[PDB]
Structure 1
Amino acid sequence: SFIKSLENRRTIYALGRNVQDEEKVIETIKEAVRFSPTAFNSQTGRLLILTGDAQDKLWDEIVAPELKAAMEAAKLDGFKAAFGTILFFEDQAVVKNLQEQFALYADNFPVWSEQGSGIISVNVWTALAELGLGANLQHYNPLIDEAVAKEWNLPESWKLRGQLVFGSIEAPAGEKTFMDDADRFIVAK
């Protein structure tokens, strides 16, 4: 079922490169984003999908040095060891255009775009889990934004929101608790 697909998506930190069909993975990522709703069908999400040498470069040559430099003012190997990283961005040029066209809702578009980023991130994450791949969601934005845009020649309007590290599952998800239903759901007739 759909609910089963949701339940099967988990944060997996222990990731490897035992990925059988990279083309199918890419196809699935694209479909998960394609079929995600966005306010006014604005489709503000943008993805940079890195594998292979690009995956190694992101972690060794961008994240590690940017983090070290930022600290002066391990886990990184576990992220590198994964098959790839999907960097999720929101296109600010579209957001701004919508704000101008519908000034009535100018304040809403940034909010809906942020919601949109969450939406496409989890849809991709869950789609990957259905292929038997694990993933985890990181936030090294805004630290790495400039270096990523330069290395892969991204438009200035792409605002980095999240990095979904993915690969073969090499150890199970940890334990997870849930709130009491009574504290978050109220049903009235």
Structure 2
Amino acid sequence: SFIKSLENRRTIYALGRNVQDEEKVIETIKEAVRFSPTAFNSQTGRLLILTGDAQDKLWDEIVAPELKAAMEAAKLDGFKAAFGTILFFEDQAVVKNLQEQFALYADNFPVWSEQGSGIISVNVWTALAELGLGANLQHYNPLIDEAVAKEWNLPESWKLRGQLVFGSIEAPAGEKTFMDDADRFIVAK
């Protein structure tokens, strides 16, 4: 069931590279984004999908130095050890064009774009889990933005929002609690 698929998606930090069919994984990532809704069917999400040498490079040559340099003013090995990383962006050129075309909803489009990033991120995350792969979602933006844009020659208008690290599950998810229903759902007739 769909609810079972949602329940099956979890944050998995212990990731490896025991991935059998990388083509199928890419196809599934694309499909999850394709079938996600966005305001005005604006489809503002953009993805950079890194595996292999590019995966090593992101973590060793971009994230680590950026962090070290920032601090001066480990967990990273765990991210690098994964099969890959999906970097999620939102295309600001499209958001800007929507603000111009429909000045009525100018303030809304940035909000709806942010919601859209959440939407495609979890749809991909859940689709990967259905393949038996684990993932975790990181946020080393805005620190790594410029280096990522330069290395993979990305448009300036792509605004980095999240990095979904994914791979084979090497240890189970931890415990998770849930709020009291009564504190977040009200039903009225």
| TM-score, scaled to structure 1 | 1.00
SS at match of 1:154: coil
Runs of 4 or more consecutive aligned structure 1 residues displaced over 4 Å after TM superposition = none
Counterpart for residue 138 of structure 2 = 138
In structure 1, C-alpha distance between the alignment counterparts of 2:73 and 2:167, rounded to whole Å: 33
In structure 1, C-alpha distance between the alignment counterparts of 2:29 and 2:119, rounded to whole Å: 13
Matching of residue 162 in structure 1 with residue 162 in structure 2: yes
Displacement of 1:179: 0.1
In structure 2, C-alpha distance between the alignment counterparts of 1:68 and 1:106, rounded to whole Å: 38
Displacement of 1:134: 0.0
Displacement of 1:181: 0.1
Displacement of 1:99: 0.1
Q: Deviations over 1:41-99 (max 9, x none)?
A: 00000000000000000000000000000000100000000000000000000000000
Matching of residue 93 in structure 1 with residue 93 in structure 2: yes
Gaps of 5+ in 2: none
Displacement of 1:35: 0.1
Q: What is the aligned residue count?
A: 189
Displacement of 1:100: 0.0
Counterpart for residue 67 of structure 1 = 67
Displacement of 1:120: 0.1
Q: Deviations over 1:102-134 (max 9, x none)?
A: 000000000000000000000000000000000
Matching of residue 109 in structure 1 with residue 109 in structure 2: yes
Counterpart for residue 177 of structure 2 = 177
In structure 2, C-alpha distance between the alignment counterparts of 1:176 and 1:68, rounded to whole Å: 31
SS at match of 2:13: coil
Question: Over the residues paired in the alignment, what is the CA RMSD in angstroms?
Answer: 0.1
Displacement of 1:31: 0.1
In structure 2, C-alpha distance between the alignment counterparts of 1:69 and 1:186, rounded to whole Å: 48
Displacement of 1:15: 0.0
SS at match of 1:125: helix
In structure 2, C-alpha distance between the alignment counterparts of 1:67 and 1:132, rounded to whole Å: 31
Identity across the alignment (%): 100
In structure 1, C-alpha distance between the alignment counterparts of 2:84 and 2:69, rounded to whole Å: 24
Q: Deviations over 1:118-152 (max 9, x none)?
A: 00000000000000000000000000000000000
